[model samples]
Target: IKSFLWTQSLRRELSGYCSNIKLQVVKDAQALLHGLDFSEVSNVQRLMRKERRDDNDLKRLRDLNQAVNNLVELKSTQQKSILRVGTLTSDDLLILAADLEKLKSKVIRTERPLSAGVYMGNLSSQQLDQRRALLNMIGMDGVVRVWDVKNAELLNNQFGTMPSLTLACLTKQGQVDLNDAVQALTDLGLIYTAKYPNTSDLDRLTQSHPILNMIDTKKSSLNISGYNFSLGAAVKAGACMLDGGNMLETIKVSPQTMDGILKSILKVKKALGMFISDTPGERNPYENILYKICLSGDGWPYIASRTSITGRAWENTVVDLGLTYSQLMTLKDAMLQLDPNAKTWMDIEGRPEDPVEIALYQPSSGCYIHFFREPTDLKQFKQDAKYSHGIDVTDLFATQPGLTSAVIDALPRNMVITCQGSDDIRKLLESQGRKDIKLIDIALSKTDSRKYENAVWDQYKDLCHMHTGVVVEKKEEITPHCALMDCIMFDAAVSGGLNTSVLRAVLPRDMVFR
Candidate 1:
């Protein structure tokens, strides 16, 4: 618990330190290069002199000065003869070309600044003239503010340093085009950061200078969180049903309710898009809702849970009688990465707990089908599954001798089955000339354990009347679920395309058995 707390705190502090360093770098670069006056530039140099400097600090300062010097040399060519005016539309070029042509002077020593326009015909001639004037004023260091039609208000006269030349792309009402600006800078051999900030979060506006994609993950998390929250709320509210009433009843009786629910779901979806598009970096209440659902009874008892003592005990009880699952913890780390409102359950508990809140580790293969026999075998499989990827058993049917075609017919599509070497079932089908039924082994045999001992093989066979297969190939006879919960995650993945991350969070512990 102490280790976990310290680890969490360390991560937070490290993230904070990195953010500060990035901010400082941008500010320092701006001051040293794009400072409007000697006062700003000298203030930065003065602060640098007073501070005790390390090799890293000295290297960064040297790099900043070298970069500006290179750009300054490039700027020296700006005073040359050719004044090229680039634009998306010919009309934009026509508007700016007349005034820009006047600035053209001596050979290679009097070149005016380069300016490109996107969606520019919308601006008046006076606006175009002001744009050209601003373009003329940008000698070397200036942030090119790219705006869509609605963001024309942001085209004010101001100079800001962008060491990377990444345009501050923004749009008040429509899409922003930074392709022309990026190309213009690229032609001048000025390398720029590739990420164009598309977020509505104004906090990222400052990031356009150097390191642009600092908040990309945060933005993505908010967008996903908002949608999940809004959708979950509508579903949980029974708004997905007819008359906005009971879920199953509405599904059974009312087609109208179905349509209404669909519409409501879509409306909530639109609300999510609208909210994210309008408000950047701001907290979305529902952003962590999906994360919350995963942690809740909605998505309970992860695939890995059965490996633990408690989980094993639970499975044993379920195998003997029925099923029972009654424990949960938030995929808090995953949620925190994607949602600002995501608070760790560890922090909430304010004390050491048995089940520490942690992120659900996802497998590299992402969502894939897996097969296991008994809880013990599945338990080992589940344990290994955590070190890498998630496993969702496709076909939960027992692979025993004299297995019938009815069992094959019962399986769903895309389900890969695993079992100890037994040909009686296959021979039975072949003798019956049931060979036409599609059966292909998709299991990666050598990847994981081909077989594990079914310790409680008789418990399932004798009591549950379920056939359990053997341990080794053609060796001992074997076994396979606690009914509903056995393949619960499998069904969710197959039917809903859910992975371990989502499955662990939203599945409810107390669930109805089919």
Candidate 2:
């Protein structure tokens, strides 16, 4: 327990340090980025740009680049450390994984700043007029202000240490501010810091030196804690789900309470997205709801619960079962990069606390014949009974001997064929006429989606009562879910083309999938 607490504290402190450094870099970098895109400086000459930049602007850009490189290095080292530490305890692993995700995000932001620097470096000296203006706009949010003031010439002379230019710009601007106008040069006092109830809580916002307020600048608004806090909330929920191993169970958690479970799970995932961009981060805001899933008698993945014990004793009492999943052609088509045919969240890692793999069927691939989103539709269903025989799904089902055998036997042997999915399309020989190929079903029991792809030949024979000739291949759920405690996926039969007829959050952005 001491080791765990100590490590947790250390991890928090280290991550906090990294977040501070990353934010500082992002503030300067983002300001520069926003300034470069403003319209007022859009028409500046390139040749002049090279000759006019001040030392501060140059240093800010250079520091931005350096920060990106440093962040990348820090993220890599942190990820390695996390994996190492996670080996000792599940709780430790959970925190480490969450830290890794945040670190990755930080590194990505750093690259944005670095990319801006490269663009700025190539302009000619003639470009200085616009470049100089943009730098000021970025530094002082002159771009975001109501109008751009063309003070480029004034800026250049002031940077050259010209007393007149400095006096005019500073004094004239100072005259506008009552506090600044009264302060004598040597008598000017810097703002002092005040003590806080929790120093750690304010560490992100406060500093010892009287640095300029970031909120005062346009480029700096990107530094708002709200956005980052949302990200933190979302990432924590996802990490928790991954640790719980519920990711793969959504395929068919229960025959009786499938609807409720699906709804609960989907709610959790949708909340996760909101938390990423919208939800406020206040240290486990949904703690009670989330922990319910980890409690006794709650359908949640209990292995991650504080009450769960180590070793085989707890394992023996738990009835670890395999989920029954069948993929549709439309569902497989939706896994494309940008324009996916179907997209849902899944516990891709096979973690104990992950969300279920939610499958969205494409119009082209047939919908779920057995499961209906709406319950009333089950009795009112009308389809060509003898209309279909051949079924083509992604390798996720074909790779699993149990699923393959169930599918092949459920339909007809000659009607079944497996095709590769995703970017690469290939035919992996599962059963040729002469080879007597053994169908392997290596689907992970309950929440194990990671082992879903790997072939388990011996277990396929022992556990699954399927004919050997059936083709079986395992692949990831094309559409996976990120688990939250409240949301769940519903049957399409009852919900029409809509997965969530009631909840807007669970519904895909593009329902038509054009």
Candidate 3:
């Protein structure tokens, strides 16, 4: 090491003879890494726990638990939003209501004897068991919840929304659209089907074009100012549902398979005004406005990312397709039975696709869709799949299929996407003919995220160098010096649509930036 350094050192090296050193500056790169802080939250969880679990008491405990969960999981953008200056929605008011009457009823149900009190002291075995079950049902100090069960803002806030775009419900405890809503659905093709609304119609607005005349004439009836798609309508409903306050509830479309309408027709442009495209580095939609319908009548497109997407244009790439469609259908049907005016879809397959492009898979939060070049010899890769983390170096000549020249010509360039690698894993899949694809793998290497975002743009750069094509350009940033940071964060959010936040806000009173 000493010999190499001394011999290579600029001042002492022969290579330095021609040099007038133009040193490259290096800055602290540590801030670029993403992670979490759970210590304070863990302490909060510990402090919140108590022996007696009254419903009201348990709620306070749950709040503390959630705060900790946010700290540890870094999934709760709610707390972060709450810490800022903003007015919460009426639904959020319900969470703060601390409804003692409802709590009393719940406590009574939990303590079957009806004589058992909130305090655990002097309770019989059966009573204790019941109490535990109820507590468990409520989840970690009564804070546990399913997505559809909670007030919408808690879920919506995690997803960033520009307040100006939202048009949510006004009342905190009462229903906003009892009359006009049912009539509206009926006016549309929605009759006898279940109809639910989300916090606002922001989803629809983001997916819509400013001009209504651009919509196709045949589909003009479907236009929201020239954008012809249900997503524009659905998201508009979402924005209207939320207003600026909190969302009442996220209107989850049923048949989970049919959830794609939530995000189809939106277009998001980068500051450089480039559309995020499936093609590598081919920036055609200049003013950066182009809408593509990527979702369908299928249940919520399988959501793969850990983080909720911030913009409508970026949502389709992040929705999960793995949810059980049948289960969601049943839930919607049941809801309709309660409200006879409910609207439902007759055909779930309402969109343009070969149908084969869709796949059936279940996903959990934090995981995301990725593409890999199918290994020429996946069997070889799997032989030691437990250990291999990068491209398979083994030749597939022995075990792989014999590829015809015609097949190679049809393959999409960069079919290999690293949810986390440079080596092509999807090549094997392309050979097999499953081109438009996705997967939920958690083992993302640092190299993978960087490649996933910059791959398209980088390719554009290379294309310019090779073919003398126009260099791909993006919107000018408010500050160019910080553009790299902005680009990285934005790309990371949209491309992978990972749930993790790049922003870690500690108050100025406490942070070094102060």
Candidate 4:
């Protein structure tokens, strides 16, 4: 009974036992020997609760082997492999790496040269089958050469001045139905018809070369480029729009999505400089970029991450599927109808350097967009002003040149001038002076007067509003007799008349203004 820690005296005869069991399990075995509530969820649950029950089974359920078996729900042989995370020899790691390259090449599709153009008139009697087959393979069209020639002639006559690229407007409020956009293009005579893209394009700029040109020629793979395809980005956009995701049928382009898309594009742009493959570790272009367009799935090609994408890739990625003059105008109208929030794509992704200007998101006063001519002026003034605390640096502001016109159209507020997340955008735009476009200054100031510079003791001292249409000048008070150490018994009137605020607002006679 007293054998517990009667230590050194017993150390002379004590002996240790060894087993294949893990060290942690040995502790549970010790607890089982000592008769404690260890390694038993059922008993511990009851013991820790607000209830009680008999400990009857405790004395009967005592055995070292029982505790060992109960230590894990897993079996001995399985855990032997499960618990070992300690690694391989350096030579073994290198062996796998060499094989890894072999495995990688096996999966990557063969890279092909670019087929710069596909004029149907160039087709020969013997070449007719091959031309249509090339079109069919690219998921573009499958009609025989004669029909392609007829379609191409009518296309040239009806839609000749079509821009080489465009952002196909197929969504409202940033929510899009993909198949619908294709139908719109077809119905409007913008294209003959578009098959869901069955191919993917070059995944890097490295694959493109002026010498790789294959004019009037088509590769069996994704070799199409130039002013030939029905839509410049139907394939590219599909690659990105559907690039492996939860595979939602609808896409919502909010700020988060906009930000991700821009970031993804920037990553590719950054990589292109290093002569690397397009997207290194991207999976979803809406959220991340995909390195290449896959054969399966409905991917928007623009969203597909390919290296050295020429034409539209270097330009904006979201704009078009080859629309003609009239059709392009229709596309423009469609873009206008898209959710107004979609317009912020530029705000979300625009470059950092912009000519200095005031971009008042929430105009009336609390939040401001001021770009100081010199950065130090703002940095040095930080000690004088805060983000949410209103700023009044006079040099930062200017008297409106068109105040006369502003007074009339200054109309009722279109956007409410209230304090919202000025603190938030102070963080957003502050990130790069809002990406160096302009510094957004968000200050929460309400004109609740105690007093400050143009806060004249008398606002309506001698001015009177004759009616809603006019202001007739007659102009305008206050009471507070107090001695609290010292103060300014303001010679004017306050809104909340002599309230508790006056208690600590008084200044002593010794107070002097410089």
Candidate 5:
């Protein structure tokens, strides 16, 4: 020890060795390291506690060290590649970065109550074949939802109305077994199905399924026109049933299957659109089932419920939703049921200004139907005005002599003039000069609170009940035309068929006054 301290080199070596020695080797050094006094050692009795450091901490440290080493190797490889590719530009690097982004995995979020998982990527041809085989194993006897993902906008010279996805409603007999079908499809790996608690009709409309909404946002660039399949939506008008402003009663799914079938359509991709419809049943119509499908996507379609859709000439990729030879005609009728043909005039000011009016002459019923838009204010009419008992008082609404005379001449000698309240019921015949026809009063009796405007619209429901001895009850409300003639008129106008000029050709005299 004396020699080690005496020589300068020996001293330096001794200092280095002392510095390398651990503090634990010295007595009382623990007090300095732990910030505790040496005298407190005896008082600190034996205690059993978990270690301050965890195994996870050690594992993280090891992983971080490995990551650092990998990063170093990656940097060296990247430098080598950069040096090898002498002509590589920044733009090329940007494109390479974009390609890398496309290769990254993405998530496909499923509707609530449905199981969701990461979408690895598009399936290869072999994988697609295997998936198709599996889906085919389910047997297409009932309605099975078929959904696919695609770019929302026009791609590769595609300029038609091609929907991103299509659903086929398989029909068995006349109805579809929804539960069995959906479950089987799920079992076969066609779609992921979930069972949400049976939701109320109001909740179903306002809250349920989000698949359509999901598609809307995921593929927002596509500029989709409309959800033609929604039950509550008319082509460019509001839905009759959904617009009623009444909370629908707790819509109970059959007690047989208490759960609503929830289905996942596709992986997350931009510009995706979907079509969903059904077979013959209560919810058989595509319009009705479209609501259910929209409910699965979290009520996204309802967000733009009032948006108008103009049908364009495009090759629509159609997935047949269960239609037989006879059923095809039935489906056509069902689809057209929402929109029917009629002569309609809008209340536009200018060259062809006119109050909204519709004239529908049914050859089968031999009845000339007339409809007037509801007035903005009911107080405009006097209390004791002629035909003021809820009727069109003026002869201004009288049918013109040209088309009116032709229709009257074609009609049978004995015909029915069906109308709501007022003396105009008789005036209608006098104006047409067809007193041979009898007046059929379908109006409600006069009352202090005479708010019965459309108490009996002869368009739908039994029009015969107007003159028949059917039991009549006075109610404040009446059902609007479930299928409004305006829908037909709008479609005709869009198709360049129904307009003021067309009506003017039939009747040179203007018949309507706002």
Candidate 6:
């Protein structure tokens, strides 16, 4: 614990409180872990549940259970210190130790001790931007807002980072190699601190630490305390959230849920047009929701609760965990990311969440509309409107002197309001409650709809649609992922007359075999 420099300890005084005891608890738990059995993951999980049943009466036993698991997790990958979790008395720790002695071995404990030194440095806004750009290029978020650890294990393999994290990687000494990690961290401008840190919470946010421990853990349902107060409030709110509803005090992932997780991760890959340099099987599991399955074991994967944890930062930050969750970000916008396939919140009839509200979208069309004063040959405009390279222009302006009012009054509310240098039309559109219009672009509106040929028109039209508070755009739903040339292979199968009702039912979603 002396090795750890805490950020969230805002009291600025370290003496009086039992901080050292918490350190004792974590290290003691680590001792139990060095010997316990994990030979069969399934059998160990069975013992885990048995212990959970006994421990659930006091519930913070849940915290100790998670701490050891997270410690086991650290050996598997790497993580923050366990000081931030709920407190356990030596007696309570001993009680858990008895069970730890019983169940423990497939997962070998990584020999490194949890307590480590903290690194520090000031990050300028320019440096922040540089860090963001680097993470973006590699498609990996920092383990925290600043320095990372597990990914160091990856770069060790790529510099030595790649393949299975267990082999072709680590040193023969059975220790993680860091020469490559130094190359990776220095590339991001993160370096080790000369001494232990002595900084406040706000001060910590702006700094970096290669081994700085994070507060978050795997099971949100059973674990809640980031600090004792924040933990207490969330426990209160978490209890209130489950008041009218009944859910398992634990999270489990099922087969149906597992399939969707893999599919979801892949789609966000090649399907969403995000270029894939390596198999998603490599990086995405830890990056995406698939981690839920890896952690949950053979349990139900998808679960839902209205469980949003929103708050304000008055005086001190307050949090309310209305529900338990595996994915933190999905908790923010539930409907958009959560799978409707939830079995818990469906009232046990097992009806999944439904997308009942039909979202209406408008102004997403590529066809441009012309609102002009009828001039030159009237038949000539219609002839061009009739056949203008797959886009037809209609609704010519009235040939009247009060055409400003005429165009404004009869304005078709069309997506693209094109005019050949019609300054009057631009002002009238703005005045006539087309408040969403950009005043400058109205003058630049050309007479011919030739600009509507491709992507440019779609961009212009969507901006226009915002005035009506609608953008009737068709979003691509789930689509098969195909490589550049493989697109023709997928198209060719569909183009030749395929019977979908029976054929598609028997085939995988993407059947364009390489």
Task: Please list the C-alpha lDDT of all candidates, in the order they appear.
Answer: 0.23, 0.22, 0.23, 0.23, 0.23, 0.23
Q: Model 1, residue 262: what's the lDDT?
A: 21
Q: What is the per-residue lDDT of model 5 for residues 1-514, given as tens digits with 9 covering 90 to 100? A: 2221122221222221112111111111222223322222111111101112233332332332232223221110100011111233444344333322221100000010011101112435664464344333322111112211121111111111111100111112113343332232222221101111112321333233322221222221111122111222111111111222111111211212111211111110111222222222122122222232222222112221111112110111111111123222222221111111222221110011112233433222122234333323435432212211223434323422233333334333344433332244345335557667565444433341123223223232332111111221353422222112322233333343433221111111112111
Model 6 worst lDDT run, 10 consecutive residues: 343-352
In model 5, which regions exceed 4 Å deviation? Answer: 1-291, 294-359, 363-371, 376-514
lDDT of 1 by residue, 1-514 (tens): 3322332232232221111122322233244335333342333344344323234433433343344434321121101111122211344333223212211111001111111121123345774465455333332111132221222112111111222212221110112343432332232221111122233322333245222222233222211211111212212111111121111111221212222222332244344331211111322322211111112121111110111111111121111101211110111111111111121110000011110111111122121112123232555544423332232322233322111222233222232232211233344335445554333322224322222113223222232222222223244322233221222322232233333331222111111111
Q: Give the TM-score of candidate 6.
A: 0.19
Please provide, for model 4 over 348-374, each residue's C-alpha lDDT reduced to its tens digit, 9 standing for 90 to 100.
111122111122221111111211221
| Candidate 6, 1-514: lDDT as tens digits | 3111221121122112112121222233244335333233223333333312222222332333333334322121221112111243444334322322211100001100000101112344664564344333322211112111221111110111111111111111123343332222222221112222223431353255321122122222211211111211222222122211121112233433333333333333332332212211122211213222333323321121111111100101111111112111111211111111111000000001110000111111111111123334545533333232111222222112222233233322233432222354344456556654332222222223222223332322332211111112244222211111111222222234212210100111111110
lDDT of 5 at 504: 10
Instruction: In model 3, state the lDDT of residue 153.
Output: 20
Candidate 2 at residue 301, lDDT? 26
Q: Candidate 1: global Cα-lDDT?
A: 0.23
Angstrom error of the Cα, residue 489, model 1: value is 29
> How would you encode candidate 3's per-residue C-alpha lDDT over 1-514 as one tens digit per residue?
3322221221121121121110100000011011222243234334333332234433433443333223221121211111111232343233222222222222223221211112233345774575455434323111122221111222221212211111111110112333333223222212111133222322332243222121122221110111122332333233222212211112122323121221121111111222222211112222111111121122111111112333222222222111122222221211111111111101001011110011111011111111112243445544323331222334222221212222223332323232211123234345456566442233445455344344434322321111111222243221111112223323443446433321211101111100
Instruction: Give the true-structure RMSD of model 2.
Output: 23.8
Candidate 6 CA-lDDT value: 0.23
Query: Which residue segments of model 3 deviate by more than 4 Å?
Result: 1-182, 189-400, 408-514
My TM-score estimates for the predictions, one after another, are: 0.18, 0.20, 0.16, 0.15, 0.18, 0.19
